[PDB]
Curated annotation (Swiss-Prot):
Tissue expression profile of the protein: Expressed in brain, heart, kidney, liver, pancreas, placenta and skeletal muscle.
Localisation: Nucleus
Effect noted on mutating D139N: Impaired nuclear focus formation, reduced interaction with PIAS and increased sensitivity to cisplatin
Top-level taxon: Eukaryota
Induction: During mitosis. The mRNA encoding this protein contains an internal ribosome entry site (IRES) in its 5'-UTR. This 5'-UTR generally suppresses translation while specifically promoting expression during mitosis, when cap-dependent translation may be impaired.
Family as reported in the entry's similarity comment: Belongs to the DNA repair metallo-beta-lactamase (DRMBL) family.
Protein known as: DNA cross-link repair 1A protein
Shown chain mapped onto the complete sequence: 700 to 1040 of 1040
Subunit comment: Binds constitutively to TP53BP1. Binds CDC27, which is itself a component of the anaphase promoting complex (APC). Binds PIAS1.
Protein's organism: Homo sapiens (Human)
Function: May be required for DNA interstrand cross-link repair. Also required for checkpoint mediated cell cycle arrest in early prophase in response to mitotic spindle poisons. Possesses beta-lactamase activity, catalyzing the hydrolysis of penicillin G and nitrocefin. Exhibits no activity towards other beta-lactam antibiotic classes including cephalosporins (cefotaxime) and carbapenems (imipenem).
Length: 341
């Protein structure tokens, strides 16, 4: 059963609704981005039209093996007609190929679905500035004031400086970065750049990165592990056991590992500043957890919503508990009363 918050009223459209079988009345299935909770249910045997970005479409074709005839890529920032309804895709500032969708209903209603997003003031000068939005389907992942984290720029600065210092002190140190999905590519690309190395990785991850339209990508990544001093591994292997085991496989080339685990928010953020972050260490292995977020902080979310002034908000995350729903509704009312809409 498809839940109400994945349906677009007055249309034959659903958003990120691939795990409910054939949805009654659905003429087009939109996919905001290539993350498993959102594409859950898509496969090579899917036979309905899928609307998405060019990058998302590359991944559907190459990773999930969806047939080309059912993939409908749309350009960003461009008015398009889909089954008689005007739509626009906007960059979501999430992972590569992630979009927000503007729907212009035949009756005059305007709906924005953010997908997953990290709100930014640059969105206030997109095609959103042009008109009123009546309903907002909002990524509420971190909709509570305790959720603070630094900018992506500050986090990258910390990681670059940390890696460069360690490897300059010890040329036989290896840097390892964890991953379990697309997104957060800047972490490992920025580190490899400062160290004058390509990033080494599995054939499967290399394949995924080749779908993302990153400029000069052939210059930045490789499957030849031996030529590389920045390696990518599955997030599950970023622990003392997993990393000891990996060091053994490198054949006495290295005698130290420095590893990074990009997480979302962690309770550590309430106490410590990014400058003061320290690793967990065991012998010749150190592990840094760094708060690189691709979702809005509470303050970023509040600013976007108070700017947009929607008439109704429909949360799409943390909808499963009454306590969550009650908390989110209280903040929406606070924001409205403070700003005056
Ligand atoms: C509470 C959230 C809303 C959903 C749609 C709204 C709206 O007013 N749309 C324009 C419009 C005017 N007349 N008709 C029929 C639609 S308000
Ligand atoms: Ni996501």
């Amino acid at each position: 059963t498809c839940p109400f918050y994945k349906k677009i009223p007055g249309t034959g459209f659903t958003v990120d609704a691939f795990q409910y079988g054939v949805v009654e009345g659905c003429t087009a299935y939109f996919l905001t981005h290539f993350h498993s909770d959102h594409y859950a249910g898509l496969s090579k045997h899917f036979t309905f039209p899928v609307y998405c970005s060019e990058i998302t479409g590359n991944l559907l074709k190459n990773k999930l093996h969806v047939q080309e005839q059912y993939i409908h890529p749309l350009p960003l920032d461009t008015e398009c007609i889909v089954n008689g309804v005007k739509v626009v895709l906007l960059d979501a500032n999430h992972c590569p190929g992630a979009v927000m969708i503007l729907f212009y209903l035949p009756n005059g209603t305007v709906i924005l679905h953010t997908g997953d997003f990290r709100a930014d003031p640059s969105m206030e000068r997109s095609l959103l500035a042009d008109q009123k939005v009546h309903m907002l389907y909002l990524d509420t992942t971190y909709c509570s004031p305790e959720y603070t984290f630094p900018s992506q720029q500050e986090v990258i600065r910390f990681a670059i400086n940390t890696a460069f210092e360690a490897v300059t002190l010890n040329p036989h140190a290896l840097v390892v970065c964890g991953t379990y999905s697309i997104g957060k590519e800047k972490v490992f690309l920025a580190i490899a750049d400062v160290l004058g190395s390509k990033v080494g990785m599995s054939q499967e991850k290399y394949k995924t990165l080749q779908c993302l339209n990153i400029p000069e990508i052939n210059s930045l990544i490789t499957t030849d592990m031996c030529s590389s001093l920045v390696h990518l591994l599955p997030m599950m292997q970023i622990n003392f056991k997993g990393l000891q085991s990996h060091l053994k496989k490198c054949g006495g080339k290295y005698n130290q590992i420095l590893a990074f685990r990009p997480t979302g928010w962690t309770h550590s953020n309430k106490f410590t500043r990014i400058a003061d972050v320290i690793p967990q260490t065991k012998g010749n292995i150190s592990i840094y957890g760094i708060p690189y977020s691709e979702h809005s902080s509470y303050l970023e979310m509040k600013r976007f919503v108070q700017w947009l002034k929607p008439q109704k908000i429909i949360p799409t995350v943390n909808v499963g508990t009454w306590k969550s729903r009650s908390t989110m509704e209280k903040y929406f009312r606070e924001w409205k009363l403070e700003a005056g809409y």
